[PDB]
Design a binder for this molecule. Structure first.
Ligand SMILES: OC[C@@H]1O[C@@H](OC[C@@H]2O[C@H](O)[C@H](O)[C@H]2O)[C@H](O)[C@H]1O
Ligand SMILES: [Ca+2]
Length: 314
């Protein structure tokens, strides 16, 4: 994956017994040179760095002070937590999308910050506020949060996002601006078909002629009472229809459950998937039942069966 570079590493041979500062929620990962980076939800977007991808250390944040334009979209927001960042590398630039919102409401806006490098030691290191990408108002039937960028086989960048309301949305981005055209069509590609519609945090990857849509089912943010689950569906066309193993459309609650946790790791969710050579990893957070349900970073090797469906090992 050119936009999610990891080259020169086999995730399947590594020991993923994470150590260090592992508190995280809605994480994504990027690697530049010998340095690994984690971006996740928190004040001004929290960052963690690692030498091997296993031992993590907190490394500050993206926005020391929130851009004033946030108020034009979410005037009621009072605190400085920015949610569910997404990172990708294109044309020598790092594109970091994130969410500005308030819990339980859809008055939200997805923003974009860019940097020439992820290394704070480099003279070119500077997170630039490149403004809003797409937003939702109370009158909209969707929620503009939890972005994920994917470049299809033809090199066309697409932005997927969404949480509750109508569900998962999809829209084309322009390669130059990396923002959707003013007249771009917004497409709904997945929904539980229930009320409330508990589906969010989309992440799309392409593997062997298929596009896989990973999403999170049910409830996050409730500590050991979270009911988060990771589900997946696929399609030959990035615009859908995404269908699960049983042939059920993801627009009708379809989705094959990849992980629903256990009595030790509660509600795993808001995932990300990365590849390297022939290996792949599943990234997400889960609530620690042994530690007051604190959200913890999880990285595990992700395999793919003969049918091409992903699965976690035992
Ligand atoms: O990330 C989860 C969080 O709650 C989601 O909405 C929850 C409720 O369902 C209905 O949509 C009600 O209007 C909400 O209160 C939000 O999308 C998100 O902030
Ligand atoms: Ca995400």
């Amino acid at each position: 994956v050119h936009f999610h570079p990891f080259g020169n590493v086999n995730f399947y041979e590594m020991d993923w017994s994470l150590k260090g500062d592992l508190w995280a929620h809605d994480p994504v990962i990027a690697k530049e040179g010998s340095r690994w980076y984690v971006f996740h939800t928190g004040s001004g977007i929290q960052i963690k760095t690692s030498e091997d991808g296993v031992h993590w250390e907190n490394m500050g944040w993206v926005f020391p002070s929130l851009p004033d334009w946030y108020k034009q979209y979410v005037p009621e927001k009072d605190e400085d937590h920015l949610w569910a960042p997404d990172i990708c590398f294109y044309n020598g630039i790092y594109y970091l999308y994130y969410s500005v919102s308030t819990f339980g409401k859809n008055t939200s806006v997805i923003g974009l910050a860019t940097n020439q490098t992820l290394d704070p030691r480099d003279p070119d290191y500077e997170w630039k506020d490149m403004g809003p990408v797409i937003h939702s108002t109370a009158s909209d039937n969707y929620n503009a949060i939890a972005p994920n960028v994917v470049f299809d086989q033809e090199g066309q960048p697409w932005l997927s996002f969404g949480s509750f309301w109508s569900g998962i949305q999809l829209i084309q981005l322009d390669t130059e601006t990396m923002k959707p055209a003013a007249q771009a069509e917004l497409l709904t590609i997945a929904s539980r078909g229930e009320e409330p519609n508990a589906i969010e945090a989309p992440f799309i990857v392409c593997r062997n002629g298929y596009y896989y849509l990973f999403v999170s089912f049910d409830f996050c943010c409730r500590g050991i009472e979270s009911t988060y689950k990771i589900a997946v569906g696929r399609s030959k066309d990035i615009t859908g229809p995404y269908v699960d193993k049983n042939g059920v459309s993801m627009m009708q609650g379809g989705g094959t459950i990849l992980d629903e946790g256990n009595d030790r790791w509660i509600g795993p969710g808001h995932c990300a998937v990365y590849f390297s050579g022939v290996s792949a990893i599943l990234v997400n957070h889960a609530y620690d039942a042994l530690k007051n349900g604190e959200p913890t970073l999880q990285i595990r090797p992700l395999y793919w069966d003969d049918e091409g469906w992903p699965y976690l090992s035992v």
